[PDB]
Design a protein around this ligand. Structure first.
Ligand SMILES: Cc1ccc(-n2nc(C(C)(C)C)cc2NC(=O)Nc2ccc(OCCN3CCOCC3)c3ccccc23)cc1
Length: 357
């Protein structure tokens, strides 16, 4: 051996390749622990996620296996890409821990929202988000949890989408980065229990987009019921056509709420909150608002697609087919994940996935 060394991190032990130095805990939960580290070989800072014996039970096992498999299906600069996957254990019989390495970014979108962004920066961030989303969707992956804390950035305005769910509990949780609840970013079709398609993510991008402008959460409801009130208060009561797709109980609840005409987007998102130094900013403001009005549509059938959004005048200035059309290596298949496995089998599946990386 002599490849691995151990360090005390949290209430645990990180046994990692000697190339990873200066480990500092930055995130913790029941499903995983993330440290910042310096990669001496790459000469860069990295983030190392430890999954501690992910096979310990059925819930942990399926989540560890799903993570490894999902990350196997993606290959895009605007999505988390693994620099390394390893285990310090040498055989299956003794296999215990899995370590995932990614590039350390500078900040998450939470820390970007209350900065003075211009149209060029805003449209570029949005462009990258859309590129990332398009890649995921073509890989058969709906994120479902697109929110500012799941989006990471560097000082050059480059951006990546990830999923920093660690199944956090009272004892386990610790964060060196801001967190925000998913609720504010859930599409109405999710809220109302409708069953959904990939464009739930487009709704989330519109919420994120609006927040980048206003500096405040767009639909800040106290709970899932209240989210709906905040949606209709601004966008207005949805169509009978939309309500017809609801289950009878949810349908009647929705029909019982006060009727709202909806606020004009020129009024919800006024010129003054946008950059306006030049005549060209005025043009860009109109484009941004138009794109916003097409993402924040209650009915997913009437909501803009990622394809259309990438072609929108606000976004298309950045369009490069090498980025916005890059295909994923394969489409995610949930078959082996949704198979039932004894713990020993999950152990071997996860093991093989690591050794194969
Ligand atoms: C159960 C489960 C299943 C799937 C996922 N999942 N799904 C996706 C898609 C949808 C985007 C493909 C991605 C992921 N997984 C992740 O995004 N995992 C990670 C999150 C946060 C991290 O570190 C955050 C710290 N941050 C890193 C960037 O630099 C600043 C600090 C990580 C650090 C190292 C390795 C993995 C990390 C997650 C969980």
């Amino acid at each position: 051996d002599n490849q691995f060394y151990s360090v005390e991190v949290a209430d645990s032990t990180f046994t990692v390749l000697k190339r990873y130095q200066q480990l500092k805990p930055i995130g913790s939960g029941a499903q995983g622990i993330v440290c910042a580290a310096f990669d001496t070989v790459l000469g860069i800072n990295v983030a190392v996620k430890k999954l501690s014996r992910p096979f310990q039970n059925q819930t942990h096992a399926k989540r560890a296996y799903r993570e490894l498999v999902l990350l196997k299906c993606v290959n895009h600069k605007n999505i988390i890409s693994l620099l390394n996957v390893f285990t310090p254990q040498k055989t299956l019989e003794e296999f215990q821990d899995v370590y995932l390495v990614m590039e350390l970014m500078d900040a998450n979108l939470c820390q970007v929202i209350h900065m003075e962004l211009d149209h060029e920066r805003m449209s570029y961030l949005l462009y990258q988000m859309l590129c990332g989303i398009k890649h995921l969707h073509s890989a058969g992956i709906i994120h479902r949890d697109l929110k500012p804390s799941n989006i990471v950035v560097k000082s050059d305005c480059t951006l990546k989408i990830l999923d920093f769910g660690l199944a956090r509990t009272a004892c386990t949780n610790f964060m060196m980065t801001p967190y925000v609840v998913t609720r504010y970013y859930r599409a109405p079709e999710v809220i109302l229990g409708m069953g959904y398609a990939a464009n739930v993510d487009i709704w989330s991008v519109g919420c994120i987009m609006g927040e980048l402008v206003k500096g405040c959460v767009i639909f800040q409801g106290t709970d899932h019921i209240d989210q709906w009130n905040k949606v209709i208060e601004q966008l207005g009561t949805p169509s009978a056509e939309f309500m017809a797709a609801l289950q009878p109980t949810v349908r009647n609840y929705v029909e019982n709420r006060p009727k709202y005409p909806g606020i004009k987007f020129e009024e919800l998102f006024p010129d003054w909150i946008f950059p306006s130094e030049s005549e060209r900013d005025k043009i860009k403001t109109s484009q941004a608002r138009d794109l916003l009005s097409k993402m924040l549509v209650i009915d997913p059938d009437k909501r803009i697609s990622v394809d259309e959004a990438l072609r929108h005048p606000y976004i298309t200035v950045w369009y490069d087919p090498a980025e916005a059309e890059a295909p994923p290596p394969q489409i995610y298949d949930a078959q082996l994940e949704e198979r039932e496995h004894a713990i020993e089998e999950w152990k071997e599946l996860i093991y093989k996935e690591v050794m194969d990386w």
